[PDB]
Amino acid sequence: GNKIHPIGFRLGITRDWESRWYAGKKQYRHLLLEDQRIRGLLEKELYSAGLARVDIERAADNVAVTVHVAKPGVVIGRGGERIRVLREELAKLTGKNVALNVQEVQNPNLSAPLVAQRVAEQIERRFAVRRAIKQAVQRVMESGAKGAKVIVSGRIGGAEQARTEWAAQGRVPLHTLRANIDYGFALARTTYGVLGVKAYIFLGEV
């Protein structure tokens, strides 16, 4: 309830925006709007595939879209079918040239969102929360991350008294600007409410 969001804390220092497109005041509001819908539409359509990042750049009257995902085939479908199905429905909302593209998640144990999504699905499957955490942090550090922390808030394991559980491992210097640190939040809701899942993946202090 006191710390800063890490990513916005580092935009343009070590981390870069997820939607790079210059616009005027007359249109920045508008193009921003459908940019969210793309984040929204592609979110549900690709969560099964393991979406990581929705990079959206707007060229001249057309938005070059790049999705980062763990299941590249699961996004495209049968030989790019779903992707071909998507950019159809995609441009149906954007109206402009929906340049839809996929990019693999190299070492998906480093995608804090994917890390969060997996840990969310696990806890959403009623698995041992405290175990999912340590196991999740484990392979991440085992994946080569020089530091990683995971926290979960809310009614842990269905207990009525809310609580925040968390495991850390390796250096996680949130204060250090130049620490390439991956952040991942995961909305994990259960029958007994909602659980929060924050994923901190320290990568490099370049």
Binding site: R20, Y22, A23, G24, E57, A64
Partner: protein, 96 residues
């Protein structure tokens, strides 16, 4: 006359510098990139959603402006003009 508007300076400086090279390859005059003052646009805002009016947070949209112009037209470069590599974080103005 060509202005450039973007949010990054690196992209602009990257994108703009290549543009100055274009006429620098086949045109003139290559008026160097003149960095206009960058219109900043702040956004004070309260951190929390509820009260605590005091604890704020600021933001900004530094729309960096860079301007390169060709003195002589050099219509051979005119096609070279439209044949430009504009990354997504830069916008172009065209006049003389």
């Amino acid at each position: 006359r060509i202005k450039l508007r973007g949010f990054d300076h690196k992209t602009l400086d990257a994108s703009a510098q290549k543009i100055v090279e274009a006429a620098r390859r086949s045109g003139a005059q290559v008026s160097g990139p003149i960095p206009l003052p960058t219109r900043v646009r702040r956004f004070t805002v309260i951190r929390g959603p509820f009260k605590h009016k005091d604890s704020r947070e600021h933001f900004e949209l530094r729309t960096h402006n860079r301007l390169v112009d060709i003195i002589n037209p050099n219509r051979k470069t005119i096609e070279q003009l439209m044949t430009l590599d504009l990354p997504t974080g830069v916008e172009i103005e065209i006049k003389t």
